[model samples]
Target: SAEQFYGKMDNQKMLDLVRASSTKIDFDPTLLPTMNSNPATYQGKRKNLVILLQESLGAQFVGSLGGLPLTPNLDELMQEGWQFTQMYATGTRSVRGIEAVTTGFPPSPSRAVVKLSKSQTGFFTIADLLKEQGYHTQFIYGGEANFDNMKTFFFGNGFDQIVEEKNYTNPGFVGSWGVSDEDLYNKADEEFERLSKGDKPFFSLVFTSSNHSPYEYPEGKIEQYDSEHMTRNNAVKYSDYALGTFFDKAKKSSYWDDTIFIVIADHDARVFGANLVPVKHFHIPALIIGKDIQPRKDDRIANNIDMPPTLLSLIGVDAKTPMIGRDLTKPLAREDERAMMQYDKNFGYLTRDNLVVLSPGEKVSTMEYDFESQTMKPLEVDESVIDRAKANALFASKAYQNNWYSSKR
Candidate 1:
């Protein structure tokens, strides 16, 4: 019955459920951090910002890349930056990933927040905050910007410029997805140079598409076989190779010295594998590396929704806006370190000790989710914890309808 229920709960039906919630759906105003942008407050202002959103990249691949000899660039960054071992993606699609990282919006049943016209006009993005400090903002992608309403979303969300496939003069190996990763990175290099020449600092979001299916790319770059041959694993390897080349070239540029480079997975591939809910599918790899970073592994737990607020804090963009995200730059919150995820009917609130699954019929299932062993055991969950989980879901849903992440009051 749970399977049937989780299966048939349509998006429209879920929206009605969120609408029916009684909670106010607001986080405490007192918990908001003071926005302090005094240059002296931080070590130094990291003005130039770069976000490389890798498609369908999961922590499983990053963890296993060394043995496969796929990602030397990421491997090097792993040693040279703050490696977030416990970061999770909010949902399994690129739009879901985009919404969380940009707006720090929690998972909701209404659909991708970025795509919602009502919210897009007012949603606060990291770019919007940075632009206030005089930084130029751009979104560069390897495909058509029109895909999934990304073009409209970017225009409203603070990006001054958008570079998509049609903008390219000669894209290398243009497939259904568009330009290959190798070519896109090459163009990005030129874009970086152009941005650096200007007096204003810049924030660039680079999206790669070569890792997706039909992985059209130049052969012999990585030992991985052609798009026709290997599993999706080969494409991941090629994308890694292209990424390595991008940084190798970047290391020689002026932008290299000042830019805060953040590498995060938009989402994972295979979300439903063996278990009733494969939690590992949402676990992703994230790295924050730059001239300002001290180069250490940060084991703190986080998710995509924390990225916008956290990175904004690091770059000296003090935003007073409400966020589902907390600063990764700060110490672990006094509250339990946790993540929220939604896969169809399964809405889960995860903590170190337990996972609370909220079902559609006002039902709850609590499981013993071991952080150490990385497995789920059976649970006779306490009523209090279940209530907490229900509250988390209910509040986030309410926040969606209330537009809590809008640009301003």
Candidate 2:
């Protein structure tokens, strides 16, 4: 019945449901569609963009995040780049993170936009925007690209090319997921090298899968973190080693000075907890490293949805988009920082001080969240915040159903 109602809800009814809600997030009629970069804040020299969407590399195994010391390479990179200590994933799945980071779409109770029929084409992915600006867009993965309908989705959106396992001939190793991280990076390096020689700038999404289940990788890459050869920590460490090796080649390659490399995790592995949302497991690591980026530890409360706009600003691409994510190139006040996470049917909107949770049957609750302790205490529900959260949850599905989100400005 709810599904039927959602599909049949008119725009006016959806708007009326959120009437009198606070204007903290932009769902305003006037601001429903397009945003441009602030000229004053635009950095010159459009840099090439490369994103390493690591598989299941959670903060719990990252050394710099007060986790295990398995990620020595990552820990080192954190100190030398624009490190985000409080970055969060929008959901527990890789597709959800991909949907958010690439399209700047917020999490919703509905399935990720990647698999949605309406969003199969004309989705406002960063690739579409970048491709419009004369950049070559590509998606590279260590496994099959079509596993999650990613190939169809990416091709329909704006990706000019896709490099998957089949593209890697004579790979070093192959596992259940696909090629090893070492082989994956090697192929990526070769692609970047070739792309760098072209006249057009390039944007690549390199997704690693060695850190996935079965934890398979080339042997002796790094010291095993456990007695068992195949473990999550060891896989992460191997992935880190492969990443470090790729950076080494990248730095020496022709595109090092002209590109911005963003390292971020899709989501945590085995995201489970007694808490309804398991907000702690959502924590992940993100880093931006390049010639123009100054080394600094940014402790902002950010989400995957915020990366696209922030990256667009960094790469000096000022274009119009329907994404409501904040451009981190400009300063945001403490109160404006927030992240929305979808856990099963539950939706949680977390601000610096409070978390507004929406459940089935229109149930709502509020909790005071303590960041350091990772604890939450029940609090009197804030009517405005709850309304905003509910509206946002409804907004994504509504936008998808009505085809409100598009690349066209």
Candidate 3:
């Protein structure tokens, strides 16, 4: 089945299928709006944006989200912020999540835009929009930013600076992945301090890498969650402690009052299951924490693509792009909430009640989803959902291939 999907896909046929299905769903990527297309839609007073891109930190590890008790710090932070109870990652890889969060691009069967040749430039990233709005954009990673072509992608798009392991002279603990989360956060704090003093507002992506494979952190920072010293649980606990430490310091910093911080994971540690689309593994934790942000549990079914627009609204920047994600700041019906996830070649479109899955070779399936149990059961096919899912699966490729999602547009 996988071979047939990947090997036998004919570009023209796929395009024809996309066109036919999209018409049924009334989908058109070309008509998407840009920042320059309209007047400023005010959200509120402008504030600096800081995205804490936590690595492999999923709801499976966060206690408040009901999987495990490994994230005490994250659990506490949720109490101080607007926590999204149903945030689903777009895909399984780091680049996929980055593409979704940064560019607000929906997941496709093709490679992420970060590594795509044509997208290295003229891509409509959130950074591009912020930079156009006079905000300095930067990507700060604890590891080498060159990994997965991230540095090239960010620099070519709109980021003014790339701060990585090379920027750290004396890291507290350098593991296989890179510096400890504690050290990384401290470096980010220093960068934020400098940016806060500058004339322009700023948007920074502080990506942590300590929760990766061979998870290693300073031993004394946290008590082991298991009997072994180096395990996933222990690493997550250390990461949580480091996050708590960063917030403790940030609360005292001068930028505290003027910045909006979001803590979200790129993807889960592992995304695997017998199911064609492992919808449960795509469930991650997302929190929007900042000054004057009313604390509440938001029960919206959101995707990573929604974050960029929501962040813009929260920070009061009304720049437009070709992104089709919803601005979650406004009131929305519960039934209208949606999430999309790409599992290998399978595309999953989730609504409040059903999950519509689109596989290659014109294959489509449906399942009844139980929100509380996080389980799925086979369901009879629904043409509306199938068309809607197929159209969305096709749109990303259509947008990228036609250059309809570029910043120049």
How many clashes does the backbone of model 1 have?
0
Question: Which one is best on lDDT?
Answer: 3
lDDT for every model?
0.71, 0.81, 0.82
lDDT of 3: 0.82
Per-residue lDDT of candidate 3, residues 199-234 (tens digit): 889999998888887877787777687988888888
| TM-score comparison, 2 vs 3, better candidate | 2
Query: What ranges in model 2 sit over 4 Å off?
Result: 1-40
- The numbered model that scores best in TM-score is 2
Q: Give candidate 2's error at residue 117 in angstroms.
A: 0.8
How high is the lDDT of residue 27 in model 2?
39
TM-score of 3: 0.91
Q: Residue 215 of candidate 3: its Cα lDDT?
A: 77
Candidate 2 overall lDDT versus native: 0.81
Steric clash pairs (candidate 1): none
Candidate 3 displacement at residue 107 in angstroms = 0.4
Give the TM-score of each candidate: 0.86, 0.92, 0.91
